[PDB]
Design a protein around this ligand. Structure first.
Ligand SMILES: O=c1[nH]c2ncccc2c2ccccc12
Length: 265
């Protein structure tokens, strides 16, 4: 492996914030390699009681190798902080891309879905379920390719509430939020949420209250603006099924006619 430490890196502009520490642009001093350094404060992690998510992220994300999964290269720590050494995603997040464009055309959407579906096929083949697929955790590489990041919630499938609790529920399926056993099908529901948000500019169960979002998800109550096409409606409506077993496999998504006609391969 190789024991890094702080002074191995020049730190740059803050790329952004998370709950437990910012991510920073960094350059390794000897190679000039540009990467991102995710800082987590130990104090805050222990208090929140999620250090196992950290171990999981590191163990899981460092062994995955897929062009649409963000690489984790390693980690180090000092007294107050843990530092994850990540692949740098130069075009930013899909969240920012959505706030910039408001919503995506069917080509950009279908293409992102395809990249997501491929990355997820790779993950589910190892029974790794991400569980936190949302636009803030989807990054863009230099060619604009999508990269799944932030594997802190990920786990090997079958799993049950596996951590503490919650925050934004928008992207989570009814099994998850209700704390029932769940498996790969979780990420299929999320894909459905994403496809709607990309096309519509807001997630389909958006509400002004957690408790109201919960209700909407649990009853699967959503509607489509008129501009959304029948092919997109058909994909989304197949993904957003309350019963996981009724959700398609990823292969079926990849070969969906709407995806086939719109995706840039
Ligand atoms: O442009 C970004 N690139 C990144 N690359 C790696 C990790 C986080 C990021 C990142 C994180 C938040 C906001 C923007 C960015």
């Amino acid at each position: 492996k190789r024991q890094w430490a702080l002074e191995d890196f020049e730190i740059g502009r803050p790329l952004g914030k998370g709950k437990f520490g910012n991510v920073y642009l960094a350059r390794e001093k000897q190679s000039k390699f540009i990467l991102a350094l995710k800082v987590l404060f130990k104090a805050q992690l222990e208090k929140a009681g999620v250090e196992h998510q950290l171990r999981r992220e590191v163990e899981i994300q460092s062994h995955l190798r897929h062009p649409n999964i963000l690489r984790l290269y390693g980690y180090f720590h000092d007294a107050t902080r843990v530092y994850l050494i990540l692949e740098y995603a130069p075009l930013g997040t899909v969240y920012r891309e959505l706030q910039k464009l408001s919503k995506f055309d069917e080509q950009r959407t279908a293409t992102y879905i395809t990249e997501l579906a491929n990355a997820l096929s790779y993950c589910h083949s190892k029974r790794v379920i991400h569980r936190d697929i949302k636009p803030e955790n989807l990054l863009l590489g230099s060619a604009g390719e999508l990269k799944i990041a932030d594997f802190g919630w990920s786990v090997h499938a079958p799993s049950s509430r596996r951590t503490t609790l919650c925050g934004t529920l928008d992207y989570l399926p009814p099994e998850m939020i209700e704390g029932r056993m769940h498996d790969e099908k979780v990420d299929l529901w999320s894909l459905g949420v994403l496809c709607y948000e990309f096309l519509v500019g807001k997630p389909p169960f958006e509400a002004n209250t957690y408790q109201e979002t919960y209700k909407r998800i649990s009853r699967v109550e959503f509607t489509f603006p008129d501009f959304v096409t029948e092919g997109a409606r058909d994909l989304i409506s197949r993904l957003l099924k309350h019963n996981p077993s009724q959700r398609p496999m990823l292969r079926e998504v990849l070969e969906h006619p709407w995806i086939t006609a719109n995706s840039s391969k």
